[PDB]
Amino acid sequence: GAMLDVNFFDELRIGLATAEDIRQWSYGEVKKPETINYRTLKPEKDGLFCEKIFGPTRDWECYCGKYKRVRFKGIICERCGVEVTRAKVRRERMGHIELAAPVTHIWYFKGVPSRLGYLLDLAPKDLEKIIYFAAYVITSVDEEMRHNELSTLEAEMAVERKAVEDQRDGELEARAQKLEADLAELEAEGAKADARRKVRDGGEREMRQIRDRAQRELDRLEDIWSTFTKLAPKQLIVDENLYRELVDRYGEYFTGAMGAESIQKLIENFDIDAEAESLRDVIRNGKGQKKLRALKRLKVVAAFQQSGNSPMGMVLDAVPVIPPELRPMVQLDGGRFATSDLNDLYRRVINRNNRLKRLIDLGAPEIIVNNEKRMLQESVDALFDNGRRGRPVTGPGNRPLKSLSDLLKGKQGRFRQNLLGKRVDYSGRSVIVVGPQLKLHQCGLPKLMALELFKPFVMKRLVDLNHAQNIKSAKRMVERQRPQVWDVLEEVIAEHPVLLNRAPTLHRLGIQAFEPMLVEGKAIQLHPLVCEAFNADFDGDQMAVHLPLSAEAQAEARILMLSSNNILSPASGRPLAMPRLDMVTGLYYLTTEVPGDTGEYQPASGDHPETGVYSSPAEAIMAADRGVLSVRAKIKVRLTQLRPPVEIEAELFGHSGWQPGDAWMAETTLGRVMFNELLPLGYPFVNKQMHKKVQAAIINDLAERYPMIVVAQTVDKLKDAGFYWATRSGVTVSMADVLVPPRKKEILDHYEERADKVEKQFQRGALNHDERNEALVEIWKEATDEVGQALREHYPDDNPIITIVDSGATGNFTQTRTLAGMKGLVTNPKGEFIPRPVKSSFREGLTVLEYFINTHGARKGLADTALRTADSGYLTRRLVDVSQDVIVREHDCQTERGIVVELAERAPDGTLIRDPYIETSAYARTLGTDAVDEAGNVIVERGQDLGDPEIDALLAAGITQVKVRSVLTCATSTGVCATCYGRSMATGKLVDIGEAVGIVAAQSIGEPGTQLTMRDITGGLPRVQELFEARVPRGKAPIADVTGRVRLEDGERFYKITIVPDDGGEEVVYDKISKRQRLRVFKRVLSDGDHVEVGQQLMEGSADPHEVLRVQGPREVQIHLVREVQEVYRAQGVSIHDKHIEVIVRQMLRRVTIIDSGSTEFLPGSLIDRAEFEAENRRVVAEGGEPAAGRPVLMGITKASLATDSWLSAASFQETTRVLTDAAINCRSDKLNGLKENVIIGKLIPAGTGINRYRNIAVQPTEEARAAA
DNA sequence: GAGGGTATTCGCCGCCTACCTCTCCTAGC
DNA sequence: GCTAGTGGCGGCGAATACCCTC
RNA sequence: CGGAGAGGUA
Ligand SMILES: [Mg+2]
Ligand SMILES: [Zn+2]
Ligand SMILES: [Zn+2]
DSSP states (O other): OOOSOOOSSSSSEOOOOOHHHHHHHHEEEEOOOOOOOTTTTOOOHHHTTTTHHHHSSSTTSSOSOOOOSSOOOSOSSSEEEEBOOOOOGGGGGGEEEEEEEEOOOOOOHSSSSSSSHHHHOHHHHHHHHHHSSSSSEEEOOHHHHHHHHHEEEEEHHHHHHHHHHHHHHHHHHHHHHHHHHHHHHSSSOOOOOHHHHHHHHHHHHHHHHHHHHHHHHHHHHHHHHHHHOOOOOOOOSSHHHHHHHHHHOSSSSEEESSSSSHHHHHSSOHHHHHHHHHHHHHTTTSSHHHHHHHHHHHHHHHHHHHOOGGGGEEEEEEEEEOOGGGSEEETTTTTEEEEEEHHHHHHHHHHHHHHHHHHHHHHHOOOHHHHHHHHHHHHHHHHHHSSSSSOBOOOOOBBBBOOGGGGGGSTTTTIIIIIIIOOOOEEEEEEEEEEETTTTTTEEEEHHHHHHTTTHHHHHHHHHHHSSSSHHHHHHHHHTTTTTTTHHHHHHOOOOOOOOESSSOOOOGGGEEEEEEEESSEEEOOOGHHHHTTOOOOSOOEEEEEEEOSSSHHHHHHHHGGGGOBBBBBTTTSSSOOOOOOHHHHHHHTTTOOOOOOOBOOOOOSOOOOOEEEHHHHHHHHHHTTTSSSSTTTTEEEESSSSHHHHHHHTTTOOOOOOOOOOOOEEEHHHHHHHHTTSOOOOOOOOOOOOOOHHHHHHHHHHSSSOHHHHHHHHHHHHHHHHHHHHTTTOOOOTTTSSTTTHHHHHHHHHHHHHHHHHHHHHHOOOOOHHHHHHHHHHHHHHHHHHHHHHHHHHHTTTTHHHHHTTTOOOOOHHHHHHTOOBBBOOOSSSSSSSBBBBBOTTOOOOHHHHHHHHHHHHHHHHHHHHHHHHHHHHHHHHHHHHTBBEEEOOOOOOOOEEEESSBBBBBOOOOOSSSTTTEEEEEEESSSOOTTOOEEEEEEHHHHHHHHHHHHHHHTOOOOOEEEEEOOOOOSSSSHHHHOBBBBSSSSOOOOOBBBHHHHHHHHHGTTTSSSOOOOOOHHHHHHHHHTTTOSSSSSBBOSSSSEEEOOOOOOOOEEEOOOOOOOSEEEEEEEEEOOOOOBBOOOTTEEEEEOOOOBOBBSSHHHOOOOOOHHHHHHHHHHHHHHHHHHHHOOOOHHHHHHHHHHHHHSSSEEEEEOTTTSSTTTTTEHHHHHHHHHHHHHHOOOOOOOOOOOOOOOHHHHTTOHHHHHHHHSSOOOHHHHHHHHTEEEEEEEHHHHHHHOOOOSSGGGSSSSHHTOOOOHHHHHHHHH
């Protein structure tokens, strides 16, 4: 189509290659297994590197050397024969090998299912025997001629059989006469009875040998006749002697062969139309296992019939040879070559082919030629796919060689290693340290790394400023780091954004852009407020630096990716660039009121006025400086630049407003005034202690009510203040600060008494081992709880450890109890708790037998963490692949469908109680219908963001359920619409028209997978994986399918649950339910004669998603999956909005399984996209309506990912070989419409700024501005 | 003998990202 | 220096090997 | 800088 490659690509088509195509690609034949000569280091003629085939190895030079100049361009030498051109041609030209005998392609013979087996209806064992010269096969037979000749051959064989058996009978009669002669011989004298019996035994055993000879000969002839009369094509005849007799006796009437030539002949004499008709007939009739087999056979046969591709491409008469530059051979230090693996395999193929050709030409017996053909077959199989059949062809070191099929597969294959990822220029790396002085949009960049990244710009500026005369002088000056380059570098790097990235890149904010500023040193200075987004600490981490070059790239880095523009988490909307650790401690210390402190407010005592009231915060600061006042002492202050709270403002000023400069008396501490002076001017005064949650709420309010620049400046100011006041907060660690509970011994003795009583009861006969273990795990659990409570009560409120934990900065109280109380219960290699506790704390020091088990547990945890981090990445990759083409495409589909969210179900006594999980279900959603209460007017209009004010108004009005728009019900053909998706969690506004929401959903789901532990029902990451893979749950719990009463039965190892429907049409029963599982409690436990719902879950466990779809419908399975995943994630304390899970679940429900094909071309049991199915049915009903009937189906992420319309995307994901062979057989054409495909071919992705409406903007000055010039 | 089921059994596919340092590379005539 | 060649495990689907009547 | 192996960092 487009020759080598030229822009305006339209499609990428694949198919089977014929021998004619292979010989057309070829520039010449390879017929010598010689790579390079050692005496001259030049390619050998007709070898794997021959220059007459693959082109010159030097620019405009010939092998002989007659022409060695650019003038002799395009002329083929008359002596050497190598065309004079550039040396890059060796990367493009291919050769070929002319095989002496036909060979099969291993992909279409050995790959399960064997496609040759389906095409020819031969079992894989028959193909194994025939292909590798182990059994003959009948290729043809002449029926009419053989029948007409049989009409006489029957009599002829009868005649010869009669002749043979009559000769045998004559021989036996002669033997009888000889027996009579022997009788006379032994009767001539006095013989022995035993001697008579011995001679009789000899005679009769010879006679029986004759009888057995007759029987065996007749069996041979009868078998030959039976084989011939019912002989048919595609029959294997082992026992070469039988086939030899068949051909000798009946040379004509048929043709038998062996090897790949026989398969080629069979494919030649094979009409596809008749086979397809027979398969379709067997499908429409018959039913059963035959129909099941015919379905697959027809799949392959229709694949070969619909297209204009012949099936004769499975047998190869020639082998292409890859260009030399793609399989180079290098030389080790000294001059010894390290040959590649491809060269060795090509060499073996060439050797075997040449020797086979020699034997064939010279003449040889059948056996040797067949052996050589088999070895050639095996050599070509090893070349194409090494190790698929038989032992791998190994090289030195007993390691299997690489094949052509290993260059495309795996984590190190072509796709995932070279096309989906690359190594790039203008990039560096070093260690990261902390720069507190930076701002949220700045980073410190080492001078030596900046000089190298910005080398061309510095050279250009050096030439411009007359420091060098040409570019070479400037380049040398930069290489030598002369003192004149730093001054120009300072100005060159000004306002040039730089991208920073830290691996692993779990979510979007792992890459962010900053404004570089040169620093002294070799480590990068990172802002403290981006560590959470990067997940970076400063114990040795390293980061990578990338430099955008073009104007568009700089614009993207400066607008889309700037660090100060990404404050909120895209997964949940919570702020990520907010104070933590030291900053939280400092702010918590500052904004704390300690009763009875210095300079505290004092009411009038009847002899002096009130004490502790100040006329301004400046006076309070002066008093604090003098040491008369404390920053944490309650006072009365007059404030004029701080806005009063809502209550004070309403009851003090009214209507008009605060109008900065109005004085009001505040009753707070000085630290709170200092904290409130760090917030925007119009923000109401906050009088509270700043726990981390209070700060998070403040930041969320600022983000949702102010522009992001104000938020960035506010977080910078809070960082400064927190770091300043954490130094003066007086938090340290000393063994005097680690207080021990004052009565640990008493509690331990009290519970040891209980343990002793239980142990003695066990010693007596009252309870078995398990009861004792459970009782001892209890008692000790309560002892640990009581010790923790005593420890908490003992500690003062201002202890550094208590302050750090309670401030929300970091840590929890379990660690505090372990450090100062007692560790408690440990776990056995199976996970169960040991009945013996660890009564020592790390302040006292564990003993040697309490340390051994502790180390056991710690190492077990570390290993589990490693396995979990390995397991989460695979799920993230699958999630990304399944939903990579879900992109916002419209603004509104104007659909009337939606979903209902509970939104604070009501109380029984009568009251509205807010649903706990409301921010991940109801917020950031658009209304689908107007909300009305008790026939009143609408409370919230259709198409409302439905934020906090809207939800509060809805709750006040007394309405619980509201219908909202969801992607599950979006009507857009491709992608989704902005209104259905709703608010963007990162931005806080309606999502844009180019936003790629599938990748965001995948990254949001997959990122918190390590926190979510991998803990007979699955309960963690395995549970999530089985939910997303649509597998059978494991502990499957049956669900009813028709409302009615139940006749529960009680028994051992089985329960009989019978559904007696209200209609009574039929009764369903479940009898295999093992007694291990309990019975679910719904509405009291399930009991006999109890009415149940249609979708009720009878037992206790996890219901499979496939039954709920078959019984209740798609919406029910959607809500089921969303609820299950959300609960699995909530159990660990992770908040993800439901829209991401909805995106994934939408991607999982997109196809329908066919039942009746009708006039349509869809085969039964095929998965067809719902839109395509509906379009085909609507087209068909117009003309001779015979519409197909289909049913909804649920597919896992892997199946939905591998059932794509692009063979390139599917091959770059998994199972490259199977996908490629199927695509080649079906002759699939790839329309390059997708993110991964455009990434592979190096084109602008169809999302974001690469969309047509954005990339085609036209810019021009206004007429007035143009005139003003 | 001949349709209807098997009914395990075996083979193939999958198993996180980024970086740094160092040693060795065929046997026989 | 040159020439030749008996320490992974789960999930899924096709395939033999096996009756089971019939 | 082609391949194999060993060790280490986050
Ligand atoms: Mg670290
Ligand atoms: Zn020449
Ligand atoms: Zn929509």
